[PDB]
A paper describes a structure:
Although few studies have been dedicated to the uncharacterized protein [name], sequence similarities suggest that it is a lysostaphin-type metallopeptidase belonging to the M23 peptidase family. Proteins in this family are characterized by a conserved active site containing an HXH motif, and all are zinc-dependent.
The structure of [name] was solved by single-wavelength anomalous dispersion at 2.4 Å resolution. This metal ion is coordinated by three spatially adjacent residues (His295, Asp299, and His375) and two water molecules (W142 and W141). Two other histidines, His343 and His373, take part in interactions with the metal ion through the water molecule W141. One possibility is that the Zn2+ was replaced by another metal ion such as Ni2+ during the expression and purification of the protein. In our structure, the short β3-β4 loop of Domain I stretches into the catalytic center of Domain III and forms numerous interactions. Based on these interactions, Domain I of [name] is capable of tightly associating with Domain III, which blocks the active site and the substrate binding groove, suggesting that full-length [name] is in an auto-inhibited conformational state. Based on the comparison of [name] and other M23 metallopeptidases in their active form, we propose that the maturation of [name] requires the amino-terminal domain to be removed.
Residue numbers in the entry: 57 to 95, 102 to 245, 250 to 262, 266 to 420
Amino acid sequence: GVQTAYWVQEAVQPGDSLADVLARSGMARDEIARITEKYRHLRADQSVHVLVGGDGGAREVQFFTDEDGERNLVALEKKGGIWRRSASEADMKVLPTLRSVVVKTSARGSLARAEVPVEIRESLSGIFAGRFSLDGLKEGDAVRLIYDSLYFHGQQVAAGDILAAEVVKGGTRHQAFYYRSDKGGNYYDEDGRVLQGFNIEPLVYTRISSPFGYRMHPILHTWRLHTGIDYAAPQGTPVRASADGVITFKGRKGGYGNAVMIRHANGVETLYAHLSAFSQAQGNVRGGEVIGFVGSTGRSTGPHLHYEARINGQPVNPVSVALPTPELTQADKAAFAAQKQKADALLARLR
Ligand code: NI
């Protein structure tokens, strides 16, 4: 009898194009065209979804883009015969995720079995990197986490930042709390003291135009993930290394324009882009010496620096990880205490 609509999932293979994946799914030739007419692009490690109507006609197509610098969540619907970027306020919903796990084999291993996003395992590693090694957790060691999770139409699509984390290694308790204020946040321990190389910011900037993490466009309601920090600064402004390490690259790089990377050791790297010019200071960099100057090369509006920290792999909120953490004043102390208590109430849920 009558046919019902169904979803088709097509994974994205190496250096694949949208039209490519869309074609392997079985989508019509002329249909692929009407789509790519308005929409180095397709984020690998995923799969584009296509809703097929009972009549075999495509009605929707959602997927993630991995453009250089940021990733976009593209949702497209077909109405009246035209593909339009679908979006709405109620589409996404962020919830606090309470995950508790006890180490058995390895720390990173057990956390993976507990359904803990790779992003979080690495973000957690850098946060406590100044107290212990996340890989030195023996059996019986606990890891209690609380982090925002993004749900698209009731379906978990990503993971926000860590709100609080309690780790017990060998019986020693280590706590980390996320604190935000003013008109990104930072991580502090239970006593409000700084946790933990990166003793300075990459430069002197006028203001931070765009923070790290997921954010919804105020009017388009679309969602995008900025894989770094946008430091607004006059072009030509000296861009120095945040810490020691060794520069491993430099030159034009996709939408990043001129950029350089530094392997700060311990399995961590950094990247500064959109530079107007370098300064050629390869080899080992003491940490602090100029390595570039602000510009607007690659995919960028005006002058500013793109700071991106990549722990054991890909993008990770550089805050309190690959940047210095400011001390808490009275303009905080009280507020922080109020926030620490809220997170601890959720933590106690995993004890
Ligand atoms: Ni950026």
